[PDB]
Amino acid sequence: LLDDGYRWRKYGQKVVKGNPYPRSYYKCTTPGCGVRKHVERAATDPKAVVTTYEGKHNHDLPA
DNA sequence: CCTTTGACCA
DNA sequence: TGGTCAAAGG
Ligand SMILES: [Zn+2]
Could you please report the per-residue DSSP string of chain A?
---SSS-EEEEEEEEETTTTEEEEEEEEEETTEEEEEEEEEETTEEEEEEEEEES--SS----
A29 Cα: distance to centroid of ligand 1 (angstroms): 6
- Go through A13-41 and write b for each residue having 16 or more CB atoms within 10 A of its CB, e for each that does not: eeeeeeeeeeebebbbeeeeeebebeebb
Q: What are the residues with a C-beta under 7 Å from any atom of nucleic chain B?
A: A 1, 7-14, 29
Q: Quick one: DSSP state of residue A61?
A: -
- Kindly list the structural domains of chain A, giving each domain's residue range(s) and its CATH number in brackets, ordered by start: 1-63 (2.20.25.80)
> Would you say A26 and A6 are in contact if contact means Cβ atoms under 8 Å apart?
no
